[PDB]
């Protein structure tokens, strides 16, 4: 298909986010590459405004599910690649249990041969010394299942999942995710049967990088459909 064919090799990625969380305004730029053949992502993000005012882990899901590996027998269920190159809008509400929420609106599309994710993020209702604004979350990341369903009147998809952020005291900060995706272009997209994406992520630091930053290595496989 046109869209899937754009992902058979290594594709460079750019991420650009502007955020406002409880009036703390910040921006992040990221770069790296994806290899959807292996479900593989490598990205490095820089906060360009100084110190990031929320913990890096809380932004991982916001910072390109077209790089998930869809098994061959599941090709017909890959909405994300089918919207390319024109792209899709991706919107979420991320509800941090007993704390505030993020609302995000992003557009994921090609600019030339580069896959771009441009995001606007708004966070409200955060506690000044909760786990987010108080920076109480460990610098690590768990493995999740992203449950996808068709959203036929939008010509797109929805997703619902729970992200678990470990807290430095050993507890966990839940971040409920609700997601909607809508194609931007006029080409045919794929409306999938129910399925999920199996995720795993590893966070690290670049020892020579003195700006506030995050290095992310991520592997994602679509699953839940046998034939
Ligand atoms: Mg720049
Ligand atoms: Mg079917």
Residue numbers in the entry: 2 to 64, 68 to 231
Authors' own words:
Green fluorescent protein (GFP), which was discovered in the jellyfish Aequorea victoria, is a light-emitting protein consisting of 238 amino acids. GFP absorbs UV–blue light and emits green light. The structure consists of an 11-stranded β-barrel plugged by a chromophore [Fig. 1(a)]. The chromophore is 4-(p-hydroxybenzylidene)imidazolin-5-one, which is formed from three intrinsic residues (Ser65, Tyr66 and Gly67) in the polypeptide chain by a post-translational cyclization, dehydration and oxidation.
On the other hand, the E222Q variant maintains the chromophore in the anionic state by replacing Glu222 with a neutral glutamine. The Cζ–Oη bond in the A form is 1.365 (10) Å, which is 0.05 Å longer compared with those in the B form: 1.314 (7) Å (S65T) or 1.315 (8) Å (E222Q). The hydroxyl H atom of Thr65 in S65T is hydrogen-bonded to N2 of the imidazolinone ring of the chromophore, while the corresponding H atom of Ser65 in E222Q is hydrogen-bonded to Gln222. In the present work, we applied charge-density analysis to the E222Q variant in order to reveal the kind of interactions that effectively regulate the electronic state of the chromophore. The phenolic oxygen (Oη) has a negative charge (−0.97), which has been thought to be stabilized by hydrogen bonds. The carbonyl O atom in the imidazolinone moiety (O2) is also comparably negative (−0.84). Consequently, the total negative charge of the chromophore (−1.05) is allocated to both the phenolate and imidazolinone moieties. The negative charges determined at both Oη and O2 of the chromophore of the E222Q variant indicate that the chromophore is in a resonant structure between the phenolate and quinone forms.
